[PDB]
From a paper:
The recently discovered CDGSH iron-sulfur domains (CISDs) are characterized by one or two highly conserved 17-residue CDGSH motifs with a consensus sequence of [ΦCXCXX(S/T)XXXPΦCDG(S/T/A)H], where Φ and X are a hydrophobic or any residue, respectively. The [2Fe-2S] cluster is coordinated with three cysteine residues and one histidine residue in the CDGSH motif. We synthesized genes for a type 3 CISD (PcCISD) from Pyrobaculum calidifontis, which is a hyperthermophilic archaeon, a type 4 CISD (RsCISD) from Ralstonia solanacearum, which is a soil-born plant pathogenic bacterium, and a type 6 CISD (MmCISD) from Magnetospirillum magneticum, which is an aquatic alphabacterium that utilizes iron reduction to derive energy. The four CISD structures display striking similarity in their overall appearance, with dual iron-sulfur binding modules and a β-sandwich dimerization module.
The MmCISD structure was determined by single-wavelength anomalous dispersion (SAD) using the anomalous signal from the bound iron. The MmCISD structure is monomeric, with each of its two CDGSH motifs binding a [2Fe-2S] cluster. The pear-shaped structure consists of two iron-sulfur binding modules at the base and a compact β-sandwich on the top. The structure is composed of mainly loop regions (L1 though L5) interspersed by four short β-strands (β1 though β4) with a topology of L1-β1-L2-β2-L3-β3-L4-β4-L5. One [2Fe-2S] cluster is coordinated by Cys25, Cys27, Cys36 and His40 in the N-terminal CDGSH motif in loop L3, whereas the other [2Fe-2S] cluster is coordinated by Cys61, Cys63, Cys72 and His76 in the C-terminal CDGSH motif in loop L5, as predicted. The monomeric structure of MmCISD displays an internal pseudo 2-fold symmetry and bears remarkable similarity to other homodimeric CISD structures. The N-terminal half (L1-β1-L2-β2-L3) is related to the C-terminal half (β3-L4-β4-L5) by a pseudo dyad axis passing through the center of the structure. The two iron-sulfur binding modules pack back-to-back with a polar interface. The completely buried Lys64 plays a key role in bridging the two iron-sulfur binding modules. The side chain amino group of Lys64 forms three hydrogen bonds simultaneously with the backbone carbonyl oxygen of Cys61 and Cys25 and the side chain carbonyl oxygen of Gln33.
Author numbering: -7 to 79
The structure:
Amino acid sequence: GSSHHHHHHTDPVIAQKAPYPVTVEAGKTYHWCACGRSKAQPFCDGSHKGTGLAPVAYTPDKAGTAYFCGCKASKAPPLCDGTHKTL
Ligand code: FES
Ligand code: FES
């Protein structure tokens, strides 16, 4: 939401204004927390229940480091696209 006045209970919250780097395995599906509520960031732990928000599945083609979005405002979820810098 562009509006800055209020947090609505269905809005994502920032976990941190910085990515969560994670070494990922090729072909394994990761479930990114889109809501900011998970206690196991950057991954969903079911805490989204009650907000209407939902995790995003991410299956990398190859092994490497994925910089998952921590601020929850990336325009290219689930990965950091730098939006945290201006959020
Ligand atoms: S805990 Fe945040 S999307 Fe599931
Ligand atoms: S942590 Fe969200 S865009 Fe970088």
